[PDB]
Each structure stands twice: as structure tokens, then as C-alpha cells.
Design an enzyme around this catalytic site. Structure first.
Site, PDB file in Angstrom:
ATOM      1  N   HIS A 187       0.810  -1.221   0.000  1.00 12.70           N
ATOM      2  CA  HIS A 187       0.000   0.000   0.000  1.00 12.70           C
ATOM      3  C   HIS A 187       0.849   1.281   0.000  1.00 12.70           C
ATOM      4  O   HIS A 187       0.310   2.351  -0.202  1.00 12.70           O
ATOM      5  CB  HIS A 187      -1.017  -0.001   1.153  1.00 12.70           C
ATOM      6  CG  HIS A 187      -0.451   0.393   2.489  1.00 12.70           C
ATOM      7  ND1 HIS A 187      -0.203  -0.520   3.493  1.00 12.70           N
ATOM      8  CD2 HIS A 187      -0.087   1.600   2.984  1.00 12.70           C
ATOM      9  CE1 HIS A 187       0.287   0.109   4.544  1.00 12.70           C
ATOM     10  NE2 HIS A 187       0.366   1.396   4.259  1.00 12.70           N
ATOM     11  N   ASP A 239       0.092  -7.623   1.822  1.00  8.44           N
ATOM     12  CA  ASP A 239       0.517  -6.238   1.856  1.00  8.44           C
ATOM     13  C   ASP A 239       2.033  -6.158   2.033  1.00  8.44           C
ATOM     14  O   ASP A 239       2.516  -5.420   2.865  1.00  8.44           O
ATOM     15  CB  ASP A 239      -0.205  -5.484   2.984  1.00  8.44           C
ATOM     16  CG  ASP A 239      -0.234  -3.970   2.766  1.00  8.44           C
ATOM     17  OD1 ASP A 239       0.241  -3.487   1.709  1.00  8.44           O
ATOM     18  OD2 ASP A 239      -0.744  -3.264   3.674  1.00  8.44           O
ATOM     19  N   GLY A 296       3.232   7.120   8.257  1.00 11.00           N
ATOM     20  CA  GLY A 296       4.584   7.123   7.722  1.00 11.00           C
ATOM     21  C   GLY A 296       5.532   6.140   8.381  1.00 11.00           C
ATOM     22  O   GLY A 296       6.685   6.061   8.001  1.00 11.00           O
ATOM     23  N   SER A 332       4.783   2.833   8.424  1.00  6.97           N
ATOM     24  CA  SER A 332       4.476   1.491   7.927  1.00  6.97           C
ATOM     25  C   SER A 332       5.728   1.006   7.242  1.00  6.97           C
ATOM     26  O   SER A 332       6.398   1.771   6.562  1.00  6.97           O
ATOM     27  CB  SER A 332       3.252   1.446   6.991  1.00  6.97           C
ATOM     28  OG  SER A 332       3.476   2.208   5.821  1.00  6.97           O
TER      29      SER A 332
HETATM   30  C1  LIG Z   1      -3.107  -7.831   4.989  1.00  8.28           C
HETATM   31  C2  LIG Z   1      -4.483  -7.267   5.195  1.00  8.28           C
HETATM   32  C3  LIG Z   1      -5.274  -7.111   3.901  1.00  8.28           C
HETATM   33  N1  LIG Z   1      -6.679  -6.737   4.226  1.00  8.28           N
HETATM   34  C4  LIG Z   1      -4.639  -6.100   2.964  1.00  8.28           C
HETATM   35  C5  LIG Z   1      -3.896  -6.529   1.871  1.00  8.28           C
HETATM   36  C6  LIG Z   1      -3.319  -5.614   1.021  1.00  8.28           C
HETATM   37  C7  LIG Z   1      -3.469  -4.259   1.244  1.00  8.28           C
HETATM   38 CL1  LIG Z   1      -2.713  -3.172   0.131  1.00  8.28          CL
HETATM   39  C8  LIG Z   1      -4.207  -3.780   2.332  1.00  8.28           C
HETATM   40  O1  LIG Z   1      -4.407  -2.437   2.630  1.00  8.28           O
HETATM   41  C9  LIG Z   1      -5.306  -1.651   1.895  1.00  8.28           C
HETATM   42  C10 LIG Z   1      -5.288  -0.306   2.250  1.00  8.28           C
HETATM   43  C11 LIG Z   1      -6.122   0.590   1.610  1.00  8.28           C
HETATM   44  C12 LIG Z   1      -6.977   0.152   0.614  1.00  8.28           C
HETATM   45  C13 LIG Z   1      -6.999  -1.186   0.257  1.00  8.28           C
HETATM   46  C14 LIG Z   1      -6.166  -2.090   0.893  1.00  8.28           C
HETATM   47  C15 LIG Z   1      -4.780  -4.716   3.176  1.00  8.28           C
HETATM   48  F1  LIG Z   1      -5.496  -4.292   4.232  1.00  8.28           F
END
Ligand SMILES: CC[C@@H]([NH3+])c1ccc(Cl)c(Oc2ccccc2)c1F
Ligand SMILES: CC[C@@H]([NH3+])c1ccc(Cl)c(Oc2ccccc2)c1F
Lengths: 642, 645
Positions: free
Chosen positions: B71, B95, B151, B153
Site C-alpha cells: 500500500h 501487503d 509514515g 508502515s
Molecule cells: C493484509 C491485510 C489485507 N486486508 C490487505 C492486503 C493488502 C493491502 Cl494493500 C491492504 O491495505 C489496503 C489499504 C487501503 C486500501 C486497500 C487495501 C490490506 F489491508
């Protein structure tokens, strides 16, 4: 950094479209060089700094825009940085000579009331004129849609300029009207002298006058000039924000000019019958303002200071001095609004690098730079003062911390020392230093009209402005050589203060100086209405309406919040009063709410929130009448800048 | 644009964990280093402070790899000594992304022991005690405002020995206060490394003997929606092909009939045929309206254009994922050209050209030359309806066959026929199947985003944003099909693909309740199947929050709901519900925006402040907050809400 043209808005009848001419890299390089070869066309430029984007409108061969976006910055041009031709802080207007290729709009004097506002997105918004500087949007729009359009033109139908947009007039975060800088203010500014000498004190006039005095700290503005006036035979009052500077003047004046003056601070007072009195603003407000007939001349020293006592003290004098028999007010500072830091002959400026044993705000300090001698290090917080002091002590450097709360005796005054301190130093201690090392950031408070349910007062760390940089650097190089070391070379524009400062003034008026909100408004209104002083948004009716509702506070909580000495002791204590009477807990158990700690076993349920002064951990109810009252207060017209 | 190391966090050698930061680059150096992807500065430390042009966060080398959050970094490259370093691991689901640690970079080492006392390092070099409460969660010993964690993360959580337990990626918040922190565990980093660096999905799977979910990443015109189900049909399997677009669905069916031999079943609102064939073409909306999967009917279900993040598609795919195994399917195929993590690569049939300030037609701060579009078949993507109408107008006046297309207009207004310039929103991609000699892309789109603004409840605001890879790739896709094509753009930029906002979850519950007779509980099950399935677009888990909100909104007015459904705008349920509550209190709506047209006829009888439930736009009228539903929603804001950092 310079201001940079990054696009334009082309007009034709009234329609518009826009063109972009720079991306990010170009903007930054062009802002550092101050050299822009790009050809300028149009009457409306889209412009940008490293922090904001907004507009600029050429009128009468001048490119105009708002002080609150441009500050005193230069404009990048063909042959390099362009210095500003006009700088009118009071009207939120600045101007560069129009560059080659630019067109100007002509002023409007048919006097039409159907107006058209052009935005950064090149839309054309109809506006009905309401006054000299106000107009109502025919269709209310969310405030966010006007953001970045400060500096755009307000046009009559014939296409001429009525003024430039400077701010929205919100009702609960929705814009019903617009504040603009009228073209007649532009022409007035153009006929004013660019050079105006405020280095000499003026002679006492026949009838009342307010005069400005711009001179270096130690010109004798607060020593020699009061002495000269007293020789002519006048009674003179010198007001100053520092207790330690006020006391220091008594001994200095008795030696140097043979005058043993009256001294008035909270911790010490001396009456000698002398014709010269030195007081703090705060002690001046405690003594109940101007005494009828006691003084001929009042000298408000360090009138650059945007603390609540200073603003309230100076607005009191501006409201009272004439009526109490004075003939002269002198507003005195070395760093007036619109000033930038310039090289100091006596001070050698050296950027910090990454090499150094001592890490400091991303950069480093060499142990060899502070091992011997006297050195002052400015940090943004006390936590940081404490840890840097400990580090230095562990390396066997003789090092001490200073901030609000500590007795100044941690000094030491003679001998090798590094002082690690916050801006509290400025008012607490008067000595100077072989060097100043400066983090170049400040803590400040900002109001947010967040309607959740009411307002928020947030503490934030931000870059220093031009007064902070100059005043911090000016703790070395006083009648002897000096060195100033910095983490970053920037500077925010000088001379503006946030709406929280206003809220602070009402709070102190209630907590410390027995002033009604109506009374406080009168005094601030004199400050606002007097030019050449720091500027803020006009939110007086709002803040007055809010504190006016805060009745029958509990005196013990007030006493306790004053004692603990933190910010907004009236707001803090009023929330605690409401919580205790509603038998409900505080927003959190942060140190802020320790006046309620003995009632902790019996307080239960949701907090009747009035406003946010920090994190809220507990649940909140909105049913308390006081909350309902403060919510209603938020429906008032609020200038916010765009 | 590459990610750029602009500094580092230096951890203490021994004794208690402490840290300090060092800044190795300014803004100018950051921008240059991001455009060249060349970073000759050497890499010290194990925790790096990284930046893009748009944001800044942390990255932490562990076991050879410099890890950080998807993200924050998306699929971007890392500036390096010999140029841009491409990512080695790209795990959208966790993520977590990873570049191979540059020369002489230093790596923390995993928490071998297994303590439950943890320490989070922030971008300010603060070291913050955390108490592990799970595999991927720990609570702050002293709750904090979440602004203080932004900031950070990518920063590490350490055990007392200074070994890495994971990397921070989000806070769990209660009403704006972080009570706990979410991280990517270190053993999810080793699960990532004990997979192959390259995985193949370019070919349709073989039918497995037991239920399996597979992915098909192949381009349009590979025949993902015609040939592959035809092929499966030829081997004797029954196949359902799902697609978001009514026009695409009809086209594939019609193509199948004349080319591959089969006369398929078709199921849409406007046309439905049962022929008894073993292929069925449906839209997600009709599939849902039919009540999902019927027992034993299909062996194979192709979920086509599975990159789409409209509510219907998510809800539909969620359904299939929850219902297919039990309905006796052997194979679910998630098909797309542009899966999460993908990047816009050059297309050999398509010549890509930056617009300049040279041109007669102003277009989004740049210019279109009349020449480039005067003759041929051309497509111009604009972000709003309004602009399309302004641009059709400005173009035709200068002698062009210009027409607009956006939601509301019937297609066929797009002729063919020859010379034309169609100006359109992304609605073009579900309304019209044809292609063009060139595409012109404003590189921006409209989207919806939720703010948990506590004023009193939440806000859903329409914003304009830079396009993502899926957007860019799909918008370009309408040229260079078989023959040569041209793509003209305003901006080279590209946001990471495959993330969607929490407001999209909101739309799923709303569509659940408005169109498909799903309780909030039933919608949660379906969405849960979508989140838990990997390789699909990802979002933040706010299912309980949103379920809890819609569970309260009972006894809605059937008439207002029918009108907001018919008008076609977003959140017909929430809109109709706010109107139900207004009409029953004889109060006006928050404004007289078009959104509230169902209440125009009652304007004479509506007086006083609006009992506001939430914000779906500007609120002009005074508000009261005394309504039981407002309070009910106010209580829901106490839920645990993940927010990113
Ligand atoms: C690991 C948790 C999963 N729910 C997750 C996986 C990938 C990403 Cl980029 C996550 O965070 C976001 C943040 C904002 C919008 C969409 C997703 C995210 F929350
Ligand atoms: C012209 C009205 C005056 N009150 C005024 C003068 C100068 C400036 Cl920069 C003004 O605006 C701001 C805005 C934010 C903070 C301080 C001041 C401003 F509001």
C-alpha cells in the site's frame, strides 16, 4: 525557495481554460534557481511553492497574489529571482512587476454587482457583490472546491478586475460567500512608498499617534530611547514579554543613564517614583491596563511576539492609551511582519552535515563544535531537550536542559556549558552564546473547525518562520563574534498567527485578567484594526460567542489548571466542571484532567464532550446543553483561507 | 517513478532498544533519484526511510530482502547503484513487497525465541512498547492518536533481543485512537520466500478432480471468454461465464453461436434464453438476481474481468466463492488481463505519445491537435459527464462528428459507420464493445472514498484521482486490437493496481439490501469468501463495521427505495434511507442537490433541521443529531477499524 509559475488560465465573452507548463522536477529546480526562462503569457498565472499551489493576477502591470501563500518570497524570472515590489501584509496582498509577455486586466469602475470568479480549474463562478470586500456565491459550494484559487480574479461582466480572491466565508464547512482584495486596495498599495524608515524613534506629537520602530535588539530601543524621552521630560512605560528582560532593565538603566526606574513583574515589583516604568504585558494586564494620566508615551517592546498575553496587552494599550492621556504609542521590534532573515555581519552561518558524533534532527553535531565554550541548542520539545542533554552529559560534556517549568538557575551563567532548550529560553534567560545550533522547527497549536462535535485544538510540529529563525540566531553574535548552525535553510512567512491564539486570548482573559469575552473583543479589535502588526483571521465574534456561554465554572478546577500552568486552563477547567456536575468521566485520564482524579471512583458513563483538546478515549454523549450551545456557535460565518 | 531511500533509522548496538534517524537526501535529490532509478549512495543500516513523490514510509531488510508495504510502494522499483531494482516478491494479499538487498546492506534476523514483549520503531526513531496478542497483532501499552503512526508502515517490531518479529502496516483504531497495531509476521516473509519467484497463469487450467480455484492472467483476444469455455465444453463440461457487462455478455454468446458452434444459454435483464446448451453466459447482476449457484448445474465457472471493483462484481464473485464447491463445481476460474500488482507494459501494436501544450483543443492542462483526430475512429476518455458534454460541444463546433457517452445515454448514439470522435467516461467500457484508431486518456477518474469523520458518523465523498494500472491498461486496450493503434496521454503516472476503498464494501451491503434481498449477515458471508480468497483485488477488513451499520437501517420506505434504484446513482439504499427518515419527521433533506430529488414534491411540507445519519455530500441545512438511527450509527463508530500508516 522562489515562487514558480507552473501554468496559466486564459480568459476570453466570459469563459476560461487552463494550461500547465511545469511538472514537479521543473518547479523545484526553478524554485531553487529562481531562474525561469519559460515565456509568460496571460493575465492569470497558476503558481506554486514547495508547499502550496495558488493563482496570481496581473493588474496595472503588476502580478498580484496573497501574502498567506507567497509570503515575502521572490518570483523566479528570466534573469533570476524577482524581489517583490509591494508587500502589504495587512491586506493579504503582495505583487511583483509583471514579467515580459504578460497582459494586465484593467480595473472596474462602472461598478457592476454581477461578478465572476475564476478558479484554478478554470470554472467561472457568478457572485453577487455585498460590500467593498464581500460577495455571495449564487450557488453555495463545498469549501474544498475553492482551495488553490487564492489570487484568482473577481471580474465584472465587461471583463475588468474588481479584485483578487483571498478566502471563503464558510457556514459549517460550506461556502456561501467570498472575501476578496479589492482593486482600490491595490491602487492604494501602489501609491505607497516602498522604502519607509522605521529605524528612528519619533518625536512626541501634539496629539495622539501610533508609530513603528524597526531596530536591532540592543539598538537601545528599550534603554537609550526611554532615557532620551525622560530627559525631554516625559513619563514613559516600556512593556516587554520577558520577566528576566524587564528586571534586567532596572539595573542597566540605573548604571548607564542614572535612572532607577519602576519595575513591575509578577515575581517582583519596585516603585521608585521615577518617570520611567518597565513592566511585563502580563503584569500590565493584572494591574488593570492604563492608569488615567500616568504616562505620556507607551513603548510596546517585542511587538512581533504572537503569544496571547502580548497580543492582549498590546490591544489593551491601543484601546486605552488616548483616553488615559497618552500622546504616543511606539510599536517596537527588530523583526516586523514581512521581514525575512538576511545575513548578519557578526555571525557566520554553517549548515550541519551527516558527519558528527551527535545525531540531531537527521543531521549531526561534531563533538569538537561544542566541547569547550558556551553553546545554545534549540530543540522543538522538552522531551528532546532532555534526551540530548543526557547524551551530552554521558559524553562528559557539561550540559543542562531548559524549558517551561524549570527554574532558570539551571543556567549556569559563567563557565563552559551547552544549554539544550526550547523557545522558553527567549523569555526566561537573557544571556548570549558563542554559538547557536537550531533544529529549525517549532511546536505550535492549530484550531480545526471539525464539527465532531465542535472544534479541535491540535498541537503540531512545524517549520520555523522568519522571526523564529532571526530571534534564535540572535542569541549569538551580540557585540562579539558568533556562529549559527542549522539543520535546514528554509523559512515560513513571518507575521501571521493561528485562530487558536485568539481562543487563547479569551481563555486567559477569563482565567487570569478578569476580562469578559465582550471586553476581550474590544481589545483584540484594536489590535486587528491597527496596521503594521501581526495578522490573523477575524474570528472574534465566533470565539466571543463560545466563551460567553461558559458560565458558573468551578473556581477550584480553574485554580488547579492555572496552578499546573498548561494551555487553555479555562477550557480545560470548564470541561472538568461540566463532567463533575454531570457526574460523568473526562475525555481521557491524560495528565490534562488530573483535577478530576479524586472523583474517578464515582464518575461513570459517556463524556459530555464540549470540544477536543487532545485524544478522546471515552465514549461521548452530545446531549449536554453546553455542547448543544457550542454546536450552535459553529453556524457562524467563518473565514477560512483558500 | 522508483522508490528512493532518503534516510535511515539506526538501532542501538546493545543494552536498551533505542534509535535515532539520519537523513541522506533532500526533496530535489529524491525526485531526480526517483526518475533515473539510479542511486549511487551506499546503503547502511537495516531500517531505511523510503519515499515516493507522493508519500514516505519505512523499509526493513530481513534475511537478504528489503521488505515494505504494498500500500506504500505498489509494484514499483527501488533506486539502486546500477539503476532500478525490480521487486523480487510481490504479495498483494499480505501487503508485502521485497527488493533484493543492495550491496553491503544489513538485515535484521528473525525472532528465533518467541517473546510476547515487543517494540515498534517509528519513522521518528521512537521505540514503542507493544504487547503481542496474536500472530499478526499486538496492543499499544499506551494508546495514541493514529496521526503519530502515519509514515511508519514498513517499520519493524522487535523482540527484546532486537530480532524482527514483523513489519508494521496498520493500526486498529477506536474513534481515532490507535489501541493496537497490525503487522506482517516474519514467518509470512519466509512463506513468501519458500514459494517460486515466478508463477504461471497464462493458460487455462486443466479441470481438476476436486474443487480448485485457479487464476487466468491472459489478454483480451486470447479468447478468455469465448475460446476457453468453448474448449472446456468440447471436453464435456458444463460452463458458466460471468461478466460485468450486459453488452459483452450478449456479444460473446452471439460470437459463440456463429463461430464455435454452440447456441449458449443467455441470462441478462434485457435478454434471457434457455437453449439447453452446456454453456451459459450471464452477468454478475443476473446471477445474483437468480439467487446465485443452483445445485449440479455447472462444473466450471469463469468469473471474467475479475479485476473489476464495482459492487455487483465483488458480490457476484463472493457468491460463487462461497457457493461453488457445495453446488458441485470442480473449477472456478478468476480471469483478467490486469490482476492485482500488474503494471502497464508496452504493447507492440500501440504507439504511445505524450500530449503537449501545442494544439487547438485544450485537454486537462495540455492540448490536442485537430489533425490527430480530424479523420478516423477516435476515443477520448474524460473523468466526468460534464467535461464530455463540454468537449463534444467544443469539438463539433470546430467541425467534427463528436458525441458523448456516459451512464444514462443509450449506446447506438455511438455509430459505426465511420468518422467519429466519442467522448466518454469509463461507462464506455461496459456499454460499448468496439475499438478505435486512437485513444486519448485524461489519466484521471472519479472515485469514492470513505472518511470516518465522526461528524457525527461517516462521510462518503466523491474525489478525482490519478488512474491506476488497470485503468490505464483497460483504457489503452480499446486501440491496437489486431491492427496498429495510437495512445495519447496527459500524464505518464500510474497508481498501484488492485486496491479498493472501504466505501466499495459499503456499496456491497447497500446493493445487497437494495437489489438482491440479502441481509447484512448474508452479505458478510459472501464478502468474507472474497477477502479470504487470494489473488483478487484487496481491501481493508471493515466487514463487521459495515454489517453493523446496515443491520440498524430497518423499515425503509419501499417507494423511495424504488426511485433511487431507478435513477441509477450510488448508494440507493443509504440515500433512500436518509429520505425515509426525513419524510417521517417532516424535515428537509441535507440539501436540494439532485441526490434528494425523491423529496422535491414534498418540499412545501418539510420544515426544520435535518436528522442527519451520515454525509453523502454537502449539507446546507441545519442539523439535529437526536434521531435514534443517528445515535445507533454513532455507537457503531466504536468498532475496531483498521487504518493504514
Ligand atoms: C493484509 C491485510 C489485507 N486486508 C490487505 C492486503 C493488502 C493491502 Cl494493500 C491492504 O491495505 C489496503 C489499504 C487501503 C486500501 C486497500 C487495501 C490490506 F489491508
Ligand atoms: C485581510 C484580512 C486580514 N484579517 C488578514 C491579513 C493577512 C492575512 Cl495573511 C490573513 O489571513 C491569515 C490566514 C491564516 C493565518 C493568519 C492570517 C488575514 F485574514
Amino acid at each position: 525557495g522562489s515562487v514558480v509559475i507552473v501554468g496559466r488560465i486564459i480568459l476570453s465573452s466570459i469563459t476560461a481554460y487552463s494550461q500547465q507548463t511545469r511538472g514537479l522536477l521543473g518547479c523545484i529546480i526553478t524554485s531553487l534557481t529562481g531562474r525561469d526562462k519559460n515565456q509568460v503569457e496571460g493575465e492569470v498565472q497558476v503558481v506554486s511553492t514547495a508547499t502550496q499551489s495558488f493563482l496570481a493576477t496581473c493588474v496595472n502591470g503588476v502580478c498580484w497574489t496573497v501574502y498567506h501563500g507567497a509570503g515575502s518570497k521572490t518570483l523566479a524570472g528570466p534573469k533570476g529571482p524577482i524581489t517583490q515590489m509591494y508587500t502589504n501584509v495587512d491586506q493579504d496582498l503582495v505583487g511583483w512587476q509583471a514579467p515580459p509577455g504578460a497582459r494586465s486586466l484593467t480595473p472596474c469602475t462602472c461598478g457592476s454587482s454581477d461578478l465572476y470568479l475564476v478558479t484554478r480549474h478554470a470554472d467561472v463562478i457568478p457572485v453577487r457583490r455585498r460590500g467593498d470586500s464581500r460577495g455571495s456565491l449564487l450557488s453555495p459550494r463545498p469549501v474544498s472546491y475553492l482551495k488553490g484559487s487564492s489570487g484568482g480574479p473577481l471580474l465584472c461582466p465587461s471583463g475588468h478586475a474588481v479584485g483578487i480572491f483571498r478566502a471563503a466565508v464558510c457556514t459549517r464547512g460550506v461556502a456561501k460567500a467570498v472575501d476578496f482584495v479589492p482593486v482600490e486596495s491595490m491602487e492604494t498599495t501602489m501609491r505607497s512608498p516602498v522604502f519607509t524608515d522605521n529605524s528612528s524613534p519619533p518625536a512626541v506629537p501634539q496629539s495622539f499617534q501610533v508609530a513603528h520602530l524597526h531596530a536591532p535588539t540592543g539598538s537601545g530601543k528599550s534603554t537609550k530611547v526611554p532615557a532620551a524621552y525622560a530627559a525631554q521630560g516625559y513619563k514613559v512605560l516600556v512593556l516587554n514579554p520577558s520577566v528576566a528582560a524587564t528586571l534586567g532593565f532596572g539595573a542597566y538603566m540605573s548604571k548607564a543613564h542614572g535612572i532607577d526606574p519602576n519595575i513591575r513583574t509578577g515575581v517582583r515589583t519596585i516603585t521608585t517614583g521615577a518617570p520611567v516604568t518597565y513592566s511585563t504585558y502580563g503584569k500590565f494586564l493584572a494591574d488593570g491596563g492604563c492608569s488615567g494620566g500616568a504616562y505620556d508615551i507607551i513603548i510596546c517592546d517585542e511587538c512581533h511576539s504572537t503569544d496571547s498575553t502580548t497580543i492582549l496587552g498590546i490591544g489593551t494599550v491601543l484601546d486605552q492609551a488616548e483616553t488615559a492621556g497618552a500622546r504616543l504609542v511606539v510599536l517596537a521590534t527588530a523583526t516586523p511582519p514581512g521581514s525575512v532573515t538576511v545575513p548578519h555581519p557578526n555571525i557566520e552561518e554553517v549548515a550541519l552535515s551527516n558527519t558528527g558524533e551527535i545525531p540531531f534532527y537527521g543531521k549531526a553535531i561534531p563533538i569538537e563544535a561544542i566541547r569547550g565554550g558556551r553553546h545554545l541548542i534549540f530543540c522543538h520539545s522538552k522531551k528532546k531537550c532532555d534526551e540530548l542533554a543526557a547524551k551530552l552529559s554521558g559524553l562528559g560534556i557539561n550540559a543542562v536542559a531548559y524549558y517551561r517549568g524549570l527554574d532558570v538557575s539551571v543556567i549556569p551563567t559563567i563557565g563552559d556549558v551547552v544549554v539544550v532548550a526550547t523557545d522558553a529560553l527567549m523569555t526566561g534567560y537573557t544571556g548570549d552564546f558563542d554559538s547557536v545550533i537550531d533544529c529549525n522547527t517549532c511546536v505550535t497549536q492549530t484550531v480545526d473547525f471539525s464539527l465532531d462535535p465542535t472544534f479541535t485544538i491540535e498541537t503540531t510540529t512545524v517549520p520555523q518562520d522568519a522571526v523564529s529563525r532571526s530571534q534564535r540566531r540572535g542569541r549569538t553574535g551580540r557585540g562579539r563574534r558568533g556562529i549559527y548552525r542549522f539543520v535546514t535553510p528554509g523559512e515560513r512567512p513571518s507575521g501571521m498567527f493561528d485562530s487558536s491564539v485568539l481562543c487563547e486570548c479569551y481563555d486567559a482573559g477569563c482565567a487570569w485578567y478578569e476580562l469578559t469575552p465582550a471586553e476581550t473583543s474590544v481589545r483584540l479589535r484594536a489590535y486587528l484594526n491597527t496596521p503594521g502588526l501581526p495578522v490573523c483571521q477575524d474570528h472574534l465574534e465566533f470565539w466571543e460567542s463560545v466563551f460567553t456561554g461558559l458560565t458558573h465554572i468551578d473556581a477550584h478546577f480553574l485554580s488547579q489548571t492555572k496552578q499546573a500552568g498548561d494551555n487553555f486552563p479555562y477550557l480545560v477547567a470548564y470541561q472538568a466542571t461540566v463532567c463533575a456536575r454531570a457526574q460523568a468521566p473526562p475525555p481521557s485520564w491524560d495528565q490534562m484532567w488530573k483535577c478530576l482524579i479524586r472523583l474517578k471512583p464515582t464518575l461513570h458513563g459517556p463524556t459530555p464532550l464540549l470540544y477536543r483538546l487532545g485524544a478522546v478515549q471515552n465514549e461521548v454523549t452530545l446531549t449536554h446543553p453546553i455542547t448543544k450551545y457550542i454546536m450552535a456557535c459553529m453556524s457562524a460565518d467563518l473565514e477560512v483561507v483558500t
